[PDB]
Each structure stands twice: as structure tokens, then as C-alpha cells.
Symmetry: C2
Subunit: 58 residues, 2 copies
């Protein structure tokens, strides 16, 4: 009943979060084989962040 | 339940956004931990990630909080 203004805001937010998370994914894609379980963890947490944004910020 | 101020409380999204904020910060905190655990030869990568994490936090601090 005050909506579309923070709808736009939230699209901005979603955009900036996704941009930064994508940079993170990019960085993990360059991690070594020894750091595999770490990369895997980080990506699982990125996926989870994106799910949170998708559902409650979209 | 049809009381005048029930509908107002139910449309309050404060609690919801506080939970969004918290779940994001939780997941990001796990990313921070994982970076802090990386081999020291990939420090560059770690720092890169941390900057982005701090960027995300700021976003969340600035607009979801």
C-alpha cells in the first residue's frame, strides 16, 4: 500500500547483490584443487543467497 | 481476527526483511569463513572475495536493514 517505490529499490538491491555474488563465483572458479571443498562450500552459499533474493527480494 | 488492526500487523514486513537480512548475512559469513581457510598461495582470490562480501554487507546494511 506503499509498494512500487521499494519494489524498484529492491530490484536495485537484487542487482547489486547478484553482481557481487557473481564476482565471488568467478573468484572461486580460479581456486586450486586442494581448496575444492572450500570452493564447493562458497558456491553452495552463493546459490543459497540467490535463492533468498529470488524468493523474498523478488 | 477481523479486528481493525490485525490486517495492519499481518502486512507488516519488518520481521520478514529482518529474517532475509539475517539469512543472507549468515550465508555470507560462511563464505567469509571459507575464504579465511584457503591456502595462503591464493590470497589474492581471498581478498577479492572479502571485498565483495563487504560490498554485499553494505548493501544489506544500507537497504534491507
Amino acid at each position: 500500500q506503499l509498494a512500487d517505490d521499494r519494489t524498484l529499490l529492491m530490484a536495485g538491491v537484487s542487482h547489486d547483490l547478484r553482481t557481487a555474488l557473481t564476482r565471488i563465483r568467478l573468484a572461486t572458479e580460479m581456486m586450486s584443487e586442494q581448496d575444492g571443498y572450500l570452493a564447493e562450500s562458497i558456491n553452495k552459499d552463493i546459490e543459497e543467497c540467490n535463492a533468498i533474493i529470488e524468493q523474498f527480494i523478488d
